[PDB]
Amino acid sequence: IGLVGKKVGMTRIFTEDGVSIPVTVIEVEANRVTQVKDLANDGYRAIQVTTGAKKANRVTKPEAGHFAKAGVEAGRGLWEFRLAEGEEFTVGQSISVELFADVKKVDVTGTSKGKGFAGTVKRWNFRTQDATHGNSLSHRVPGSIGQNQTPGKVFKGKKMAGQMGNERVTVQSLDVVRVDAERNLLLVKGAVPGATGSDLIVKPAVKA
């Protein structure tokens, strides 16, 4: 199915033969089920979960009630996962990191680090025009953005300057290294999106 977990930086695991494998330390606390959606009411089968612990004043009543419907404590944020027909869960159940004990690889989804207003050099890997040889006020500019009279217009999806990052991105089929049950951790090989403290939706690899 999948679990929600905060990103807690990166380390490396030295294997006894020698190889130092770079790992991202994902803390994955008891992900507790707030709601179970089904075909009769909703038209699809899914589960809504929660994690962490939000201060009671910060949780509003429309969500304070929503948690009382289930019986669980008010976790910070809510996320949904689609069920793969066979499995079925109940409201108030606590899903832990032990689900990834069996799996080998995982897709990790997160929110990428915000680079703000980025230019075409950084954003789209555009080439910087000649830094000298007569160049006038146009080193890092995009150059042309179209043709002439024929279109007489710029085409849609033209690669231009704009907001870069702060977008949800997915890294697929990262190899799981260690699944720590006692500290509630999930060590995955490589790097996953977002900064330390950003939330990560970790789930089993669709590309098997």
Partner 1 sequence: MKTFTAKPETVKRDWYVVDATGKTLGRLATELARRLRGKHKAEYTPHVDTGDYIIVLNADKVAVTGNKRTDKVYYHHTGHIGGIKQATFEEMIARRPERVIEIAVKGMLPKGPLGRAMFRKLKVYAGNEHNHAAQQPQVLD
- Residues near partner 1 (CB under 8 A) are 155-158
Q: What is the 3-state secondary structure (H, E, C) of the chain?
A: CCEEEEEEEEEEEECCCCCEEEEEEEECCCEEEEEEECCCCCCCCEEEEECCCCCCCCCCHHHHHHHHHHCCCCCCCEEEEECCCCCCCCCCCEECHHHHHCCCEEEEEEECCCCEEECHHHHHCCCCCCCCCCCCCCCCCCCCCCCCCCCCCCCCCCCCCEEECCCEEEEEEEEEEECCCCCCEEEEECCCCCCCCCEEEEEECCCC
**Binding window for RNA (CB under 7 A); candidates: 14-22, 97-105, 145-153, 174-182:** 145-153
Q: Considering beta carbons, is residue 14 or 155 the nearer one to RNA? A: 155
195 binds, among partner 1, RNA, Mg ion, none (CB under 5 to 8 A by kind): RNA
Q: Is 156 in the site for Mg ion (CB under 5 A)?
A: no
CB of 21 to RNA, least distance (A): 23
CB of 182 to Mg ion, least distance (A): 25
CB of 39 to partner 1, least distance (A): 16
Out of 135, 178, 180, 191, name the contact with RNA by CB under 7 A: 135
- Binding residues (CB under 7 A) for RNA: these are 35, 37, 41-43, 60-66, 68-69, 107, 109, 113-117, 120, 124, 126-127, 129-130, 133-138, 141-151, 155, 158-159, 163-170, 172, 194-198, 206-207
